[PDB]
Design a protein around this ligand. Structure first.
Ligand code: CLA
Ligand code: CLA
Ligand code: CLA
Ligand code: CLA
Ligand code: CLA
Ligand code: CLA
Ligand code: CLA
Ligand code: PTY
Ligand code: LHG
Ligand code: BCR
Ligand code: BCR
Lengths: 80, 221, 41, 187, 732, 105
C-alpha cells in the first residue's frame, strides 16, 4: 500500500490521528518534544493517501508525510 | 524427436520428445504443445494424408486412362442431379464421420463403419503406420503440386512430367510466372534452419520458445 | 509479374487483405491481449 | 620472439603468437574476446579459401579462354537459366553451411561433411596452416585488386599485368586514374 | 496477483482496472521497473532503439510499396503540373456507389486517395522514374528493417550484450557518429545524387545495369586528383531547361548558381550536390576530433573543466558536468530532443522558402501539409525535451557532484529566470492583445485608418540586407558599391537576387504591420511556453509550497487540499499545461503560414495585408471564407471528394470535445458513478452471473490529464489537418 | 592552376615540419593537462570485451623511434593537414583560373 512516514519535527498536538478516518496513525511516547509524544503508523497498509493528516499538520514543513504508489483493494477505497 | 531430424543438427522441442512415431523435429510454430492437441493433430494429419493418397491415385489413374481434366470435371454432365448428390453425400458422411468420431473417442484409432479398428486381415505394426504417414505427407505435397500445375501450367501431372523430361532446364517451377517467388521462398527456406542454429548458439540457455497466439507457451516466458 | 516481381500484387489483393487486417487481425489482437491481461499468477 | 607485423617492437596484448600466421596486426583491437577470436579466425580462414578459389577461377577462366569475362559472366547464355540456378545454389550450400556450423559448434575446426579433419592425404602441419592463412590473405588482397581492376581499368587482370609489363610507365595508377577518362568507351 | 505487468510486480498486485492502464503507460519506463540495473536498462534501450529503427524502415518501405502499387508515379513523371499524386487505394466496403465514383481522382480506375506527403516530388528529384525502382526500394528497405530487427534481437543474447561503459563511451561515440553517420552518409548521398539524379534530370537513365558504363562528369575524376575542381562548374544547366529532358542542358555535377530552377521552382540539383559534398567533407574532418585509443584527440571533461571563466563569472564554470550528462540519460535525451526540435523547426522554415524538390512549389497543399506537419512535430519534440529535462532535474541530479557550476548557479537564481520570463510573456501578451483589440474596434467603427500599423522595420531592414530591394534601403549586398555584394558577385549573387526579388515564389515574402503583429504574437507564444516549461523544470525537485517534490516522483497527482491546495503541482503537470500553449502557438504559426500563402496563391496579397491586422478579418477571411468548400463535402444536394475532410473535421471536433470531457470533470465524481454502476451490474437478474475480474475503477488524475491531453491533441491535429487540406485542395 | 604534385608535397612537407620541429614541444603539454596523472587519465578500467575497446591501442605508446615524440599517428594527422591545405590552395587556384573572382572587388 502507501508509505506514511513521520519525522522528528512532530511535537504532539494529537490532532493528526483525529483527522484520519482510517485508524492508520497512532501516538507513541517520545522524548524529543515538550508533549513527549510522537506519531506512528502501525496500520500503514490500511491508508488510502487522503492526506487529511497533512491538512491537520501544523509544522512547517510537515512532520507526517504520505507517499502515493502501489495501490491495492483497501488503499483504493472500493467496497466492491 | 527421433535421431533423424528435419534439418541436420536440429534440436527437438521440449514437448516434442519423440514418443509418438513420424517425428522429425519439424515444429517451428509448435501447434501441438499439449498431448490431446498433439494426438488430435496426428489424427487430422493421418486423415488429410489418406484423402491425399486417394486423390493422388485417382488423378494418376484418370490421367493414365485418358479421362479429362479434374478441375474441369465438375462442369461435366453426370447421371443423378448434383444437388441430391451433395444431399446423399452429406447424409452418408453424417453417419460415417459420426462413427469415426465415436470410435476415436472410445479407442483413438482411425477405424471404419462398425469395426474399430477396421483391420480384417491384420498386419498392424508400427512401421506400417510410419510408412503410411510418410506416404500420406508425400501425397498432400503431391496434391498441392497437382493444384499448382493445374493453376499455372494448365496441364495434368503426366503432361507436366512429360514437359520436365522434354527440357528440364527450362520447364520447371522457377521459369514460370511463379518462378521468382518460388526462388525467394526456397532461399528463405534455405536460410531458415541456419537462423534457428544461430538462435540456439547465441541463446545458449533460457527458453527462447516461439511465443505465438495459437499456443500458450508465452505463459512461461 | 513484369517490372513488379518483388511482392507481386494481384488484382484481388485489397478486396482480400483489407478484411483480415480490419477484422481478423484486431480479433486476434483483442483475444491475445485479453488472455494476457487476465492471466493469473 | 615473432617476426612481428611491422618495424616497431609492439608487444601485442592479446596475440601471444600461438595463432597460425600470428603477427600482432591489430591497431584497433577488435578480437579481444576468445570466442570472438575463434569464430573470426575460422571466418578468416574460410574467406581466405574462398578468395583463393575465386582468384584461381578468374585466372583459369581467362587463361583457358572464354568469350565472356568474369565480371560479365552473370549475364550470359548458359544451359541453365539464372532462375533455375539460384534455388539449388542456395539450398545445397545452405545444407553444407548448416552441417559445418553444427559441427564447428563442438569441434572448433572446419570440415566439408562429417569427416571434419578432412585429410585423406595428411600432412596437417602447423607450417601448412600458416602457409594456408598467409596465402589466403594474399589471395584476399588479390581479389580486392581484381575487383578494382574491373572497376577502374575495365579489363581482365592478366591483361592488366600484360599492360604493366609492356608499358610500365604510361599504364600505371596515374594514367588509368586521370589520363584515361574514356575507359568506359573502350579506352 | 497477475503477471501482465511483468516489469512491475506491484502493479500486478492491483486488482482494479487501473492495472491495465498503468501497465500500458509504464511499459517502457524502464528506470522505475522492478529489479532493473543500469546496464540492463541501457541494453533494453538499445534494443528498443533498434526496434524503432526497424519500425521506421518498415513504414517507409510500405510507403514505397503502396506508391509503386496503387499510385500514379509514371503519370506524375510524364506530367507533374497536371497529374496529382496518389497515396493509396481506398477499399472501404461501407462506401456507397457515389462514394466509389467520387474518389477516382488522378486519372485512376478504382477509388484512390490523393497524396499530399510530397514523396512524388522528392522521388522525381532524386531520379526515381519507374515503379520497378520503387518496388526495389520497398523490398530493400523491408530487408534493412528485418536486419535492424535482427540486430536488436542480436544485442540481447549472452556474449553479445554490450557493457555499461560501452554505452558511456562519450568521445568515441561522438567521433564515430559525426564521421560516419553524418559524413560518409552525406558523401554517399551526394555521390548517388551526382551519379543518378543529375543525369536523370537531363534525360539520361542511370540504373544498376549501366551506372558503371556511364560517367557523371566528362572529365572523369581528373579534377579530383588534380586541383582543377572548377571543371565541375563549367557548363551548368541553363534557364530554358526541362527536368525530364536535356533541352539546353549542360555537363556539370557541382555548381553554386543559387536561387531556384526557372521551370521546377526548386533549388538546383548541382547546388545540393556541392552542398552535401561540402557538408560531408566538413563532417568527416570534424569527426576526427574527440579522443580515442590513439594518442591524439579531445576529452570532453577536460574541455568542460577548462572552460571556467575567472573572477567568478560562472562560479565553477562547466566543471563536474561531464559525469552529469553521462550518468543521467534524461539530460542526453533532453539535449537530443531540443536539438531535434530546433532542426525540425529549421527544416519547416527552410523547405517552404527554398523548395528542394522539383514541382514542389506548384503543389500548394503538399507544401502546406509538410510545413504544418513538421512544425507540430517540432513543437511536440520541444515539449518532450523540456519535460525530459525536468525529469533529469528531479530523478538524477546531484548538487554535491556539481557544486557552484553553471547548473547549480542556474538553479540558484531560478526565481529570477521564472519571474523575467513571466514579465516578458505578460508584457508581450498585454500589448499585443491591446493593439489587436484596438485595431478590431477601430475597424468596427468604419474607420480603418485609425488602427495602429507599426511597420516592421527591423525585419524589412534585414530583408534589404539579404537582397530585397522593394523597401529601398541603401544597405550592403543591395547596393553595387558594397563589399558584401562584390564578394560572391559572380558566384551566387545573380541567382539569389533574382529569386529573392521575385514575389511569385515563397522566398522572403513582403511583410506588413499585420505580419509584424502576428510575429510578435508568435514570440509571445514561444515565450509563454518557455516560461511554463522552464518553471516546471526548475521547480521539479523543490518549491516553497512543496520542497520535497523529488521524493514524490516526476508524475504524481498532487499533495492534497492542505496548504491551500496543491493541484497540478508536479512538473509533469507543468508539461501537460504547456502542451495546450504549444498547440495554440503552432496553430498561430500555421494559421499565419496558411493564410499568407493562400493569399499569395490566389493573388490577393492586399487582402491579407489589410485583413491580418485585425482579428475579425482574420476570422472572417481565414476560418469562414476558406471553410466554404470544406463543409460542402457531403451536402444533401451533392457530395464530392471532400467528404473525408468534412468528416475528419467533425471527428476532430468530437475528439476535442471528448478531451474537454476528460479535462473539466475530475476523478471523485466518476468513482461514485462507477460505484453505482457496480451496484447496477452486481445486483441485477440475468447479468450477475457475468462478473468482472478487474475491478472497474475511475481513471486516475494523472491518467485523466493524460487522456484529456491525448484526445485534445488528436482532435486538434485531425480537425486542423482536415480544414487545411480541404481549404487548399478545393480551390487548387 | 598550380601543379598538383609540387603544391601537395610542399604543403604536406611544411605541415610535417611544423608538427615535428615547431608544434611538438607545444604538443605533449596540452595533453599532459588533459590525460595526465592527477587529472582524468583513463576513462575505463578494463574487465570485459566491450569495455577493453575503449582502452588505448597497442601501437601508439610503445616508444619513439624518431628523436622527438613524432609517432605514426602524428605523422598521419599532420600529413592529413598538409593534404587538406594543399587541396585548399589548389582549389583556390582552380577557381581563379576559371575566370571567377571569389574575392570582393
Ligand atoms: C579580451 C579580454 C577578455 C574578454 C572580453 C573575456 C570575455 C569572456 N570570457 Mg574570458 N578569458 C580571458 C580574457 C577575456 N575574457 C583570459 C585571459 C582568460 C584566461 C585564458 C579567459 C578565460 C575564459 C574561460 C575559461 C571562459 C571565458 C569565458 C568568457 C565569456 C563569458 C564571461 C562570463 O563569465 O559569462 C558572462 C557572465 C555571466 C554572469 C553570465 C550571465 C548570463 C545571463 C544570466 C543570461 C541572460 C540570458 C538572456 C535572457 C538572453 C536574452 C536573449 C534574447 C534573445 C531572449 C566572456 C565573453 C567563458 C566562455 O567561454 O563563455 C562564452 C569561459 O568558459 N574566458
Ligand atoms: C485564448 C485564451 C487564453 C488567453 C487569452 C490566455 C491568457 C493568458 N494566459 Mg493562458 N491558457 C489558456 C488560454 C488562454 N490564456 C489555456 C486553455 C491554457 C491551458 C490550461 C492556458 C495555460 C496557461 C498557463 C499554464 C499559463 C498561462 C498564462 C497566461 C498569461 C500569459 C501572459 C500574456 O500573454 O500576457 C497577458 C495576456 C492577456 C491575454 C491579457 C489578459 C488581460 C486583458 C488585458 C483583459 C483584462 C481585463 C480588462 C482590463 C477588463 C477589466 C474588467 C474585467 C476583468 C471584467 C495570460 C494572462 C501564464 C501566466 O499567467 O503567467 C504570467 C501561464 O503560466 N496560461
Ligand atoms: C494439415 C495437415 C497436417 C497436420 C494436421 C499436421 C500435424 C502434425 N505434424 Mg505435420 N506435416 C504436414 C501437414 C500436417 N501436419 C505436411 C504437409 C508436412 C510436410 C511439409 C509435414 C511434415 C511434418 C514433419 C516432418 C513432422 C510433422 C509433425 C507434426 C506434429 C507436430 C507439428 C505441429 O504441431 O503442427 C500442427 C500442424 C497443423 C495442425 C496443420 C498446419 C496448420 C496450417 C495448415 C498452417 C497454415 C498455413 C501455413 C502457412 C503453411 C502453408 C504451406 C503452403 C505451401 C500451402 C503434428 C501431429 C512432427 C511430428 O511427427 O511430431 C510428432 C514432425 O516431426 N509434420
Ligand atoms: C498402404 C497404405 C496404408 C498403410 C500401410 C496403412 C496403415 C494402417 N492403417 Mg490404413 N488405410 C489406408 C492406407 C494405409 N494405411 C487408406 C488409403 C485407407 C482408406 C481406405 C485406410 C483405412 C484404414 C482404416 C479404416 C483403418 C486403417 C488402419 C491401419 C493400420 C493397420 C491396417 C493396415 O495396414 O492397413 C495402420 C495404422 C486401422 C487402424 O485403426 O489403425 C490405427 C483401421 O481401422 N486404415
Ligand atoms: C508499416 C507500414 C504500412 C502501412 C501503414 C500500410 C497500410 C496499408 N496497406 Mg500495406 N504493406 C506494407 C506496409 C504498410 N501498409 C508492406 C511492408 C507490405 C509488403 C508486405 C504491404 C503490403 C500490402 C498489401 C498487399 C495490401 C496492403 C494494404 C494496406 C491497407 C490496409 C491495411 C492492410 O491490409 O494491411 C496490410 C496487410 C499486410 C499483410 C501487410 C503486413 C506487412 C507486415 C507488417 C510485414 C493500408 C492502406 C491492402 C490494401 O487495400 O491496399 C491499400 C493490400 O491489399 N499492404
Ligand atoms: C569461385 C569458384 C568459381 C565460380 C563461382 C565459377 C563460376 C563459373 N565458371 Mg569457373 N572455374 C573455377 C572456379 C569457379 N568458377 C576454377 C577453379 C576453374 C579451374 C581453373 C574454373 C574453370 C572454368 C572454365 C574452364 C569455365 C568456367 C565457367 C564458369 C561459369 C559456369 C560454370 C558452371 O557453373 O558450370 C556448371 C558446373 C558444374 C560442376 C555442373 C561460371 C561463371 C565456364 C564459363 O562460361 O566461363 C565464363 C567455362 O568455360 N570455369
Ligand atoms: C524519442 C524521444 C523520447 C524518448 C526516448 C522518451 C522516453 C521516455 N519518456 Mg518521454 N516524451 C517524448 C519523447 C520521448 N520520450 C515526447 C515527444 C513527449 C511529449 C509528448 C514526452 C513526454 C513525456 C512525459 C510527460 C513523461 C515521459 C516519460 C518517459 C519514459 C516512459 C514513457 C513511455 O515509454 O511510456 C509509454 C507510454 C505509452 C505507451 C502511452 C502512449 C499514449 C500516447 C502518448 C498518447 C497519444 C495519443 C493517441 C492515443 C495516439 C494515437 C492516435 C489515435 C487517433 C489512434 C521514458 C524514459 C515519463 C516518465 O519518465 O515517467 C515518469 C513521463 O512522465 N515523456
Ligand atoms: C524502372 C526500370 C526497370 C527496368 C530496369 C532494368 C533492370 C532489368 O531489367 O534487370 C534484369 C534483371 O536484373 C536483375 O535481376 C538484377 C539483380 C541485381 C536484367 O538484367 P541483366 O541480368 O540482363 O543485366 C544486364 C547488365 N549488363
Ligand atoms: C597512398 C598513395 C595515394 C596516392 C598518391 O599519393 O599518389 C601520388 C601520385 C598520384 O598521381 P595522380 O594524381 O595522377 O593519381 C591519381 C589520383 O587521382 C589518385 O592517386 O603518384 C605519382 O605522382 C606517381 C608518378 C610516377 C611517375 C614515374 C615516372 C618514371 C619515369 C622513368
Ligand atoms: C529543461 C532542461 C533541459 C532542456 C532544455 C532545453 C529544451 C533547451 C532548449 C534550448 C534551445 C532550443 C536553444 C536554442 C538556441 C539557439 C541559438 C543559440 C541560436 C543561435 C544562432 C545564431 C548565433 C545565428 C547567427 C547568425 C548566423 C550564423 C547566420 C545568419 C545571421 C545570424 C547573425 C543570425 C536540459 C535537457 C538541458 C536539462 C536541464 C533542464
Ligand atoms: C620513413 C621515414 C622517413 C620519412 C617519412 C616521410 C617522408 C613521410 C611523409 C609523409 C607524407 C608526405 C604524407 C603523409 C600523409 C598521411 C596521411 C594520413 C594523409 C591523409 C590524407 C587525407 C585524409 C586526405 C583527404 C582528402 C581527400 C581524400 C579528398 C578531398 C581533400 C582531402 C584533403 C580532405 C624519414 C626519412 C623522415 C625518417 C625515417 C623514417
Amino acid at each position: 500500500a502507501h508509505v506514511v512516514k513521520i519525522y522528528d519535527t512532530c511535537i504532539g498536538c494529537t490532532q493528526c490521528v483525529r483527522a484520519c478516518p482510517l485508524d492508520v496513525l497512532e501516538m507513541v511516547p517520545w522524548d524529543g518534544c515538550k508533549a513527549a509524544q510522537m506519531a506512528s503508523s502501525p496500520r500503514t497498509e490500511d491508508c488510502v493517501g487522503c492526506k487529511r493528516c497533512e491538512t491537520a499538520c501544523p509544522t512547517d514543513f510537515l512532520s507526517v508525510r504520505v507517499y502515493l504508489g502501489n495501490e491495492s483493494t483497501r488503499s483504493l477505497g472500493l467496497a466492491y | 524427436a527421433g535421431r533423424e531430424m528435419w534439418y541436420p543438427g536440429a534440436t527437438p522441442p521440449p514437448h516434442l520428445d519423440g514418443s509418438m512415431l513420424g517425428d522429425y523435429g519439424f515444429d517451428p510454430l509448435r501447434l501441438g504443445t499439449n498431448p490431446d492437441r498433439l494426438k488430435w493433430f496426428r489424427e487430422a494429419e493421418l486423415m488429410n494424408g489418406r484423402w491425399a493418397m486417394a486423390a493422388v491415385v485417382g488423378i494418376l489413374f484418370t490421367d493414365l486412362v485418358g479421362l479429362p481434366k479434374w478441375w474441369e470435371a465438375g462442369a461435366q454432365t453426370y447421371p443423378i442431379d448434383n444437388q441430391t448428390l451433395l444431399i446423399i453425400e452429406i447424409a452418408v458422411f453424417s453417419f460415417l464421420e459420426s462413427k469415426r468420431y465415436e470410435g476415436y473417442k472410445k479407442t483413438g484409432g482411425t477405424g471404419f463403419a462398425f469395426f474399430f479398428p477396421f483391420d480384417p486381415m491384420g498386419m498392424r505394426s508400427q512401421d506400417k503406420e510410419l510408412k503410411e504417414l510418410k506416404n500420406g505427407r508425400l501425397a498432400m505435397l503431391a496434391f498441392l503440386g497437382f493444384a499448382s500445375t493445374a493453376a499455372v501450367n494448365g496441364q495434368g501431372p503426366i503432361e507436366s512430367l512429360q514437359t520436365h523430361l522434354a527440357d528440364p532446364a527450362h520447364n520447371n517451377i522457377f521459369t514460370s510466372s511463379v518462378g521468382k517467388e518460388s526462388c525467394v521462398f526456397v532461399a528463405v527456406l534455405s536460410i531458415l534452419p541456419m537462423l534457428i542454429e544461430a538462435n540456439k548458439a547465441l541463446g545458449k540457455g533460457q527458453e527462447s520458445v516461439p511465443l505465438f497466439p495459437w499456443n500458450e507457451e508465452w505463459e512461461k516466458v | 509479374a513484369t517490372e513488379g516481381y518483388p511482392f507481386v500484387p494481384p488484382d484481388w489483393a485489397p478486396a482480400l487483405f483489407v478484411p483480415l487486417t480490419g477484422l481478423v487481425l484486431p480479433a486476434v489482437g483483442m483475444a491475445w491481449a485479453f488472455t494476457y491481461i487476465q492471466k493469473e499468477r | 620472439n615473432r617476426p612481428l607485423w611491422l618495424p616497431d617492437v609492439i608487444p601485442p596484448p592479446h596475440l601471444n603468437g600461438t595463432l597460425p600466421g600470428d603477427s600482432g596486426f591489430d591497431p584497433l583491437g577488435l578480437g579481444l574476446n576468445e570466442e570472438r577470436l575463434k569464430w573470426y579466425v575460422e571466418a578468416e580462414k574460410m574467406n581466405g579459401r574462398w578468395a583463393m578459389m575465386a582468384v584461381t577461377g578468374i585466372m583459369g577462366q581467362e587463361l583457358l579462354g572464354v568469350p565472356v569475362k568474369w565480371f560479365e559472366a552473370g549475364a550470359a547464355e548458359y544451359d541453365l537459366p539464372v532462375q533455375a540456378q539460384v534455388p539449388i545454389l542456395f539450398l545445397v550450400m545452405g545444407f553444407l553451411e548448416t552441417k559445418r556450423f553444427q559441427g564447428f559448434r563442438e569441434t572448433g575446426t572446419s570440415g566439408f561433411i562429417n569427416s571434419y579433419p578432412f585429410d585423406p592425404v595428411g600432412l596437417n602441419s602447423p607450417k601448412h596452416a600458416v602457409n594456408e592463412v598467409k596465402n589466403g590473405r594474399l589471395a584476399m588482397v588479390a581479389f580486392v585488386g581484381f575487383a578494382v581492376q574491373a572497376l577502374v581499368t575495365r579489363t581482365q587482370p592478366i591483361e592488366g599485368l600484360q599492360k604493366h609489363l609492356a608499358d610500365p610507365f604510361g599504364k600505371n595508377i596515374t594514367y588509368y586514374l586521370t589520363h584515361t577518362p574514356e575507359v568506359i568507351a573502350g579506352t | 496477483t497477475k503477471l501482465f505487468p511483468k516489469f512491475s510486480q506491484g502493479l500486478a498486485q492491483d486488482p482494479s482496472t487501473r492495472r491495465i492502464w498503468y501497465g500500458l503507460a509504464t511499459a517502457h519506463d524502464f528506470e522505475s521497473h522492478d529489479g532493473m540495473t543500469e546496464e540492463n536498462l541501457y541494453q533494453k534501450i538499445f534494443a528498443s532503439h533498434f526496434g524503432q529503427l526497424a519500425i521506421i524502415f518498415l513504414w517507409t518501405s510500405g510507403n514505397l510499396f503502396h506508391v509503386a502499387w496503387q499510385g500514379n508515379f509514371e503519370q506524375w513523371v510524364t506530367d507533374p503540373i497536371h497529374v496529382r499524386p496518389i497515396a493509396h487505394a481506398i477499399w472501404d466496403p461501407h462506401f456507397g456507389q457515389p462514394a466509389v465514383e467520387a474518389f477516382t481522382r488522378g486519372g485512376a480506375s478504382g477509388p484512390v486517395n490523393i497524396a499530399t506527403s510530397g514523396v512524388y516530388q522528392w522521388w522525381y528529384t532524386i531520379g526515381l522514374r519507374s515503379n520497378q525502382e520503387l518496388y526495389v526500394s520497398s523490398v530493400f528497405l523491408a530487408l534493412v528493417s528485418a536486419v535492424f530487427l535482427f540486430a536488436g534481437w542480436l544485442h540481447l543474447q549472452p556474449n553479445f550484450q554490450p557493457s555499461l561503459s560501452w554505452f558511456k563511451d562519450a568521445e568515441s561515440r561522438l567521433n564515430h557518429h559525426l564521421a560516419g553517420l553524418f559524413g560518409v552518409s552525406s558523401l554517399a548521398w551526394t555521390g548517388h545524387l551526382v551519379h543518378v539524379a543529375i543525369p536523370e534530370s537531363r534525360g539520361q537513365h542511370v540504373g544498376w545495369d549501366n551506372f558503371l558504363s556511364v560517367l557523371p562528369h566528362p572529365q572523369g575524376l581528373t579534377p579530383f586528383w588534380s586541383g582543377n575542381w572548377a571543371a565541375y562548374a563549367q557548363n551548368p544547366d541553363t534557364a530554358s531547361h526541362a527536368f525530364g529532358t536535356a533541352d539546353g542542358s549542360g555537363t556539370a555535377i557541382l555548381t553554386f548558381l543559387g536561387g531556384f530552377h526557372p521551370q521546377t521552382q526548386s533549388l538546383w540539383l548541382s547546388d545540393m550536390a556541392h552542398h552535401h559534398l561540402a557538408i560531408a567533407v566538413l563532417f568527416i574532418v570534424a569527426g576526427h576530433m574527440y579522443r580515442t585509443n590513439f594518442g591524439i584527440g579531445h576529452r570532453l571533461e577536460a574541455i568542460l573543466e577548462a572552460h571556467t571563466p575567472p573572477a567568478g563569472g560562472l562560479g565553477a564554470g562547466h566543471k563536474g558536468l561531464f559525469h552529469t550528462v553521462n550518468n543521467s540519460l534524461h539530460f542526453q535525451l533532453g539535449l537530443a530532443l531540443a536539438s531535434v526540435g530546433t532542426i525540425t523547426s529549421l527544416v519547416a522554415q527552410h523547405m517552404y522558402s527554398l523548395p528542394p524538390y522539383a514541382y514542389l512549389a506548384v503543389d500548394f497543399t503538399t507544401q502546406a501539409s509538410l510545413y504544418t506537419h513538421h512544425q507540430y512535430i517540432a513543437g511536440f519534440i520541444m515539449c518532450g525535451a523540456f519535460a525530459h529535462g525536468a525529469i533529469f532535474f528531479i530523478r538524477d541530479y546531484d548538487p554535491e557532484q556539481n557544486k557552484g557550476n553553471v547548473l547549480a548557479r542556474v538553479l540558484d537564481h531560478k526565481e529570477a529566470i521564472i519571474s523575467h520570463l513571466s514579465w516578458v510573456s505578460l508584457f508581450l501578451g498585454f500589448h499585443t492583445l491591446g493593439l489587436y483589440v484596438h485595431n478590431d474596434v477601430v475597424q468596427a467603427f468604419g474607420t480603418p485608418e485609425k488602427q495602429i500599423l507599426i511597420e516592421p522595420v527591423f525585419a524589412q531592414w534585414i530583408q534589404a540586407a539579404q537582397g530585397k530591394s522593394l523597401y529601398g534601403f541603401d544597405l550592403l549586398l543591395a547596393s553595387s558599391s558594397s563589399p558584401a555584394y562584390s564578394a560572391g558577385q559572380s558566384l551566387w549573387l545573380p541567382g539569389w537576387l533574382e529569386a529573392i526579388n521575385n514575389n511569385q515564389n515563397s522566398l522572403f515574402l513582403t511583410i506588413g504591420p499585420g505580419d509584424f503583429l502576428v510575429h510578435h504574437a508568435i514570440a509571445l507564444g514561444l515565450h509563454t511556453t518557455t516560461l511554463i516549461l522552464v518553471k516546471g523544470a526548475l521547480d521539479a525537485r523543490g518549491s516553497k509550497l512543496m520542497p520535497d517534490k523529488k521524493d514524490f516522483g516526476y508524475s504524481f497527482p498532487c499533495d492534497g487540499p492542505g496548504r491551500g491546495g496543491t493541484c497540478d503541482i508536479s512538473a509533469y503537470d507543468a508539461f501537460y499545461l504547456a502542451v495546450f500553449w504549444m498547440l495554440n502557438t503552432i496553430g498561430w504559426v500555421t494559421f499565419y503560414w496558411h493564410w499568407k500563402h493562400l493569399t499569395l496563391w490566389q493573388g490577393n496579397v492586399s487582402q491579407f495585408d489589410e485583413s491580418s491586422t485585425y482579428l475579425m478579418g482574420w476570422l472572417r477571411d481565414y476560418l469562414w471564407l476558406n471553410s466554404s468548400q470544406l463543409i460542402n463535402g457531403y451536402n444533401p444536394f451533392g457530395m464530392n471528394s471532400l467528404s473525408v475532410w468534412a468528416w475528419t473535421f467533425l471527428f476532430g471536433h468530437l475528439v476535442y470535445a471528448t478531451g474537454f470531457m476528460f479535462l473539466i470533470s475530475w476523478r471523485g465524481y466518476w468513482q461514485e458513478l462507477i460505484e453505482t454502476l457496480v451496484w447496477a451490474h452486481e445486483k441485477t437478474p440475468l447479468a450477475n452471473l457475468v462478473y468482472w475480474k478487474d475491478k472497474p475503477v475511475a481513471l486516475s488524475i494523472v491518467q485523466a490529464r493524460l487522456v484529456g491531453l491525448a484526445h485534445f491533441s488528436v482532435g486538434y491535429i485531425f480537425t486542423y489537418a482536415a480544414f487545411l487540406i480541404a481549404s487548399t485542395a478545393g480551390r487548387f | 592552376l598550380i601543379a598538383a604534385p609540387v603544391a601537395i608535397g610542399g604543403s604536406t612537407a611544411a605541415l610535417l615540419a611544423l608538427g615535428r620541429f615547431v608544434f611538438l614541444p607545444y604538443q605533449r603539454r596540452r595533453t599532459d593537462m588533459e590525460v595526465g596523472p592527477g587529472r582524468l587519465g583513463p576513462k575505463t578500467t578494463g574487465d570485459t570485451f566491450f569495455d577493453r575497446l575503449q582502452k588505448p591501442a597497442s601501437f601508439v605508446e610503445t616508444k619513439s623511434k624518431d628523436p622527438s615524440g613524432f609517432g605514426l599517428i602524428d605523422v598521419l594527422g599532420w600529413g592529413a593537414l598538409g593534404h587538406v591545405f594543399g587541396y585548399f590552395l589548389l582549389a583556390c587556384s582552380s577557381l581563379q583560373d576559371a575566370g571567377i573572382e571569389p574575392f570582393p572587388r
